Each structure stands twice: as structure tokens, then as C-alpha cells.
Amino acid sequence: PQITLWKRPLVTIKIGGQLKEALLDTGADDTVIEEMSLPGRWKPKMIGGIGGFIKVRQYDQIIIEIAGHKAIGTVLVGPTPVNIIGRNLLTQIGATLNF
Amino acid sequence: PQITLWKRPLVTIKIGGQLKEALLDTGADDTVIEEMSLPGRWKPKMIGGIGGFIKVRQYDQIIIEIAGHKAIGTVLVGPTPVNIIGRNLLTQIGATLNF
Numbered sequence: 323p324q325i326t327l328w329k330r331p332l333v334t335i336k337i338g339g340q341l342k343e344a345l346l347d348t349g350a351d352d353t354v355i356e357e358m359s360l361p362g363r364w365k366p367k368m369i370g371g372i373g374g375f376i377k378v379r380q381y382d383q384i385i386i387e388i389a390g391h392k393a394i395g396t397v398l399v400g401p402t403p404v405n406i407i408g409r410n411l412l413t414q415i416g417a418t419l420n421f
Numbered sequence: 422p423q424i425t426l427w428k429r430p431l432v433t434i435k436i437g438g439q440l441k442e443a444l445l446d447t448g449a450d451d452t453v454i455e456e457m458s459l460p461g462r463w464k465p466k467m468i469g470g471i472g473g474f475i476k477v478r479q480y481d482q483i484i485i486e487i488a489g490h491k492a493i494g495t496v497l498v499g500p501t502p503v504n505i506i507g508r509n510l511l512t513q514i515g516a517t518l519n520f
């Protein structure tokens with residue numbers, strides 16, 4: 323699709339069999355989702371956003387569907403205010419910015 | 422242009438007579454620029470992201486040139502770690518997300 327930006331670019335994602343809403347975010351290097359259970363091991367990561375830095379749990383090689391497109395990659399879990407799909411998975415679904 | 426997302430989508434902007442680098446950010450509702458002077462009236466505002474909130478000055482009806490395209494809108498000025506062009510100005514240059 324072609325998504326205009328008059329409203330937030332929210333899409334449905336599916337992770338762990340669950341549907342969630344997430345924001346397609348070209349200003350995010352990585353994908354960050356609200357607290358949930360994911361399989362496997364995690365590693366620590368610090369991420370800096372507008373209000374300072376927070377600690378998240380990094381899970382690698384996680385299967386996630388984004389707007390009907392399949393991706394398999396890194397998901398960070400932590401106290402983000404909204405689920406964000408960042409460039410690491412936007413690239414997997416072929417997304418570009420155009421003007 | 423078509424901007425891929427393998428790296429941060431940074432562009433040059435002109436604002437307040439100054440050239441700056443800024444992130445084209447579909448996850449940002451508003452445009453937020455690092456501390457600088459702008460003319461006219463302003464009012465305080467709080468905006469929240471990962472890490473929490475920062476206080477900014479809200480200036481309305483500010484012209485910005487973004488990658489060569491002029492636009493007008495509200496610009497928030499405050500201690501953001503990066504200059505962000507948010508949806509309120511991305512729409513005016515006709516930016517879309519495509520995949």
C-alpha cells in the first residue's frame with residue numbers, strides 16, 4: 323500500500339499468535355513492543371528516546387507479521403508507550419519513504 | 422525521491438535561517454527541533470516518548486524547507502536528542518510510506 327500521514331500509520335501486527343496495533347516508525351532504528359512473553363533467551367539493551375534512556379529486553383529471530391507481511395527479526399520488549407515497528411523490520415517488509 | 426530505510430532517513434532542513442539535519446519520522450506526530458531561537462509568540466508544552474516527557478516551546482506558523490520542499494506548521498523547540506520532522510510537516514511535502 324501507499325500510506326499517507328494525515329493520521330498515525332497504525333497497522334495490525336501478529337506476534338506469538340496475538341494481534342496488536344503498532345506504529346510504523348521511520349524514526350525508530352529498532353522495533354519496541356509493550357511487555358509480553360516471548361520465547362528464548364534475551365540480552366540487555368539501552369535505548370534513548372526523546373525523554374531519555376530505558377532498558378529493554380532484546381529477543382532475536384522472532385516471527386512477526388506486520389500489516390500482512392512476514393518478518394523474522396529482533397524485537398525489543400519494554401515500557402514503550404506505543405508499539406513501534408522500526409527500520410529493522412520496515413526494511414524486511416520492503417517499506418520506503420516517498421515524496 | 423524514494424528513501425530506503427537501511428539507514429536513518431536524514432535530510433537537510435532550513436529553519437529560522439539555519440541549516441540543520443533532521444530525521445523524517447513517521448512515528449512523530451509533531452516536529453521537534455533542538456534548542457534555537459524562532460521569532461514570534463510561543464507557549465509551553467510537554468511531549469512524551471520513550472524515556473518520558475520533555476518540556477518544549479510551541480511556535481505556530483513557522484516555515485521550514487525540508488529537502489527542498491517548503492512547508493508551514495507548528496514547530497516544537499526543546500531538548501530533543503535529534504531534530505525530528507513529524508507528520509504535521511511530512512504531510513505538507515506529500516510524504517508517504519510505501520510497501
Ligand SMILES: CC(C)CN(C[C@@H](O)[C@H](Cc1ccccc1)NC(=O)O[C@H]1C[C@H]2CO[C@H]3O[C@@H]1C[C@@H]23)S(=O)(=O)c1ccc2nc(NC(C)C)oc2c1
Nearest residue numbers: 349350351352369370371372448449450451468469470471
Ligand atoms: C516513540 C514514538 C512513539 C514517538 N517519538 C518519535 C520516534 O520516531 C523517536 C524519534 C527519536 C527521538 C529521540 C532519539 C532518537 C529518535 N524514536 C525513538 O525514540 O527511537 C529511539 C528509541 C529506540 C527505538 O529504536 C531505536 O531508535 C532510538 C533508540 C532505539 S518521539 O521522538 O518520542 C516524539 C516525537 C514527536 C512528538 N509529537 C508528539 N506530540 C504528542 C503530544 C501528540 O509526541 C511526540 C513524540
Ligand SMILES: [Cl-]
Nearest residue numbers: 493494495509
Ligand atoms: Cl501544524
Ligand SMILES: [Cl-]
Nearest residue numbers: 326327512515
Ligand atoms: Cl495527500
Ligand code: NA
Nearest residue numbers: 461462481482
Ligand atoms: Na508564530
